[PDB]
Amino acid sequence: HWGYGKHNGPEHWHKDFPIAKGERQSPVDIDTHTAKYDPSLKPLSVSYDQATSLRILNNGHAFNVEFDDSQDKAVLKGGPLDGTYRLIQFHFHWGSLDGQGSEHTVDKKKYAAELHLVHWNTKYGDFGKAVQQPDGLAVLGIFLKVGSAKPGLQKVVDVLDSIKTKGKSADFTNFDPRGLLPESLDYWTYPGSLTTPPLLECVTWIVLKEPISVSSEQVLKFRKLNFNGEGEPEELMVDNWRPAQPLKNRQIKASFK
């Protein structure tokens, strides 16, 4: 029943999921001049050499590319993190137009889209147990702007017409997520939540300062997907982002000056 419309969209979520109004919700606006530079933060460690993708799925909210997370194959560590986080899936949030789409904002600036690479803390043994803990997940967030094509994204864009509607899935093997990463790993970090229901307050957010560029044709293909299932009235999959939420009692830290 939750979704992104007038009747079931973000402003409605708190009725089913009262933690919507909690003390550590995401996303947030990143005010780049109020963020504290922290020389004690470690470089982020992104080890994606042995990543194994399995499938891609339209869930009626976005498309998820899912990875085999049954061994220590694609891991995040270092940065603000203690221990080891394993890659389970990535997805995107995007707009009806290039001027909106991102969930996090930077000095109120909205990007065309935002990529979420979702990882779970290996001390909790799997994703389902991790989301039930305050340090269960690490999400690497990367902004997309429209300009030059990202070649490493085309394999994703090409398969989308095979998962047009809610519930469709396709196998999706040997996709390399290193092809979605910008040059710099300079980041902001703050404690928050899932940005979709159930909105659990289990995420260490790691948001890259440097966006990647994607072409207008690549993002246009995201916009041809559907929120509805096959054989129901077409509702295009656009504006599947949650707006910025109150910062409340939180400091956003930066890895860079």
Ligand X SMILES: NS(=O)(=O)c1cc(C(=O)CSc2nc3cc4c(cc3[nH]2)OCCO4)ccc1Cl
The footprint of Zn ion on residues 113-152 (CB under 5 A) is: 116
Residue 242 sits in the site that holds Zn ion (CB under 5 A): no
> Coil, strand or helix: which one is 139?
strand
Q: Min. distance of Cβ 51 from ligand X in angstroms?
A: 17
Q: Do 169 and 101 contact (CB within 8 A), yes or no?
A: no
- Rounded distance, CA 88 to CA 102, Å? 21
Closer residue to Zn ion, CB minimum distance, 90 or 175: 90
Of the candidates 1, 12, 61, 119, the residue annotated as catalytic is 61
- Rounded distance, CA 158 to CA 170, Å? 12
Closer residue to ligand X, CB minimum distance, 139 or 156: 139
Q: Report whether 84 belongs to an annotated binding site.
A: no
Q: Read off the tokens for 220.
A: 């246009």
Residues forming contacts to ligand X in the complex (CB under 6 A) are 59, 61, 64, 116, 118, 128, 131, 137, 139, 194-196, 198, 203
Listed ranges 18-26, 112-120, 143-151, 239-247: which one lies at the site for Zn ion (CB under 5 A): 112-120
Backbone φ and ψ of 106, nearest 5°: -125, 115
Q: Min. distance of Cβ 64 from ligand X in angstroms?
A: 6
DSSP 180: G
Q: Report whether 1 belongs to an annotated binding site.
A: no
- Rounded distance, CA 183 to CA 238, Å? 28
Q: Min. distance of Cβ 113 from ligand X in angstroms?
A: 13
Closer residue to ligand X, CB minimum distance, 21 or 148: 21
> Coil, strand or helix: which one is 189?
strand
Q: For strands 29-30 and 212-214, give the pairing.
A: unpaired
Binding mask 70-109 for Zn ion (x = CB under 5 A): ----------------------------------------
Q: Min. distance of Cβ 92 from Zn ion in angstroms?
A: 8
Residue 61 interacts with, from ligand X, Zn ion, none (CB under 5-8 Å by kind): ligand X
Active site residue 61: yes
Q: Report whether 91 belongs to an annotated binding site.
A: yes
State yes or no: cis peptide before 27, omega within 30 of 0.
yes
Residue at shortest CB range from Zn ion: 116
- Rounded distance, CA 193 to CA 245, Å? 11
State yes or no: cis peptide before 211, omega within 30 of 0.
no
Q: Do 142 and 129 contact (CB within 8 A), yes or no?
A: no
Catalytic site positions: 61
Q: Which residues contribute to the site for Zn ion (CB under 5 A)? A: 116
